[PDB]
């Protein structure tokens, strides 16, 4: 069941657009969100979509998974993967406080150009 | 650099 927090319709229900979507239902409390409302991407979207994404209430750092020093988790805005900046492969100072890409949409980034 | 924010996003500002 579940409801986007934006508009608190479902994922096969919108409540405000009346028409189906499909929501992004956190792993660890439950709640869900329209990926459109929340600004997310088709790889976020699908990203999100098969595996726990977990709402931001209860997110962590991927690497770590404790969600401790959020303020510099990196939400990965493309599946939503939290690292703290200082945490990932090629770290970061601040910057994705919004986009970023992780480095699993990243390694499949460089895999999707060519 | 504006905080107007079009929706919210995740990185959880106090609850
Ligand atoms: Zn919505
Ligand atoms: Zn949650
Ligand atoms: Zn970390
Ligand atoms: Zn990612």
């Given at each position: 069941?579940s409801?986007?927090?934006?508009?608190?319709?479902?994922?096969?229900?919108?409540?405000?657009?009346?028409?189906?979507?499909?929501?992004?239902?956190?792993?660890?409390?439950?709640?869900?969100?329209?990926?459109?409302?929340?600004?997310?991407?088709?790889?976020?979207?699908?990203?999100?979509?098969?595996?726990?994404?977990?709402?931001?209430?209860?997110?962590?750092?991927?690497?770590?998974?404790?969600?401790?020093?959020?303020?510099?988790?990196?939400?990965?805005?493309?599946?939503?993967?939290?690292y703290?900046?200082?945490?990932?492969?090629?770290?970061?100072?601040?910057?994705?406080?919004?986009?970023?890409?992780?480095?699993?949409?990243?390694?499949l980034?460089?895999?999707?150009?060519? | 650099?504006?905080?107007?924010?079009?929706?919210?996003?995740?990185?959880?500002?106090?609850?």
């Amino acid at each position: 069941g579940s409801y986007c927090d934006f508009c608190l319709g479902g994922s096969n229900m919108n409540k405000k657009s009346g028409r189906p979507e499909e929501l992004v239902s956190c792993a660890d409390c439950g709640r869900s969100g329209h990926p459109t409302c929340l600004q997310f991407t088709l790889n976020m979207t699908e990203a999100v979509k098969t595996y726990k994404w977990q709402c931001i209430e209860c997110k962590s750092c991927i690497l770590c998974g404790t969600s401790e020093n959020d303020d510099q988790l990196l939400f990965c805005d493309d599946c939503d993967r939290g690292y703290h900046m200082y945490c990932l492969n090629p770290p970061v100072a601040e910057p994705p406080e919004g986009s970023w890409s992780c480095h699993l949409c990243w390694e499949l980034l460089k895999e999707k150009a060519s | 650099g504006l905080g107007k924010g079009g929706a919210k996003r995740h990185r959880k500002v106090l609850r």
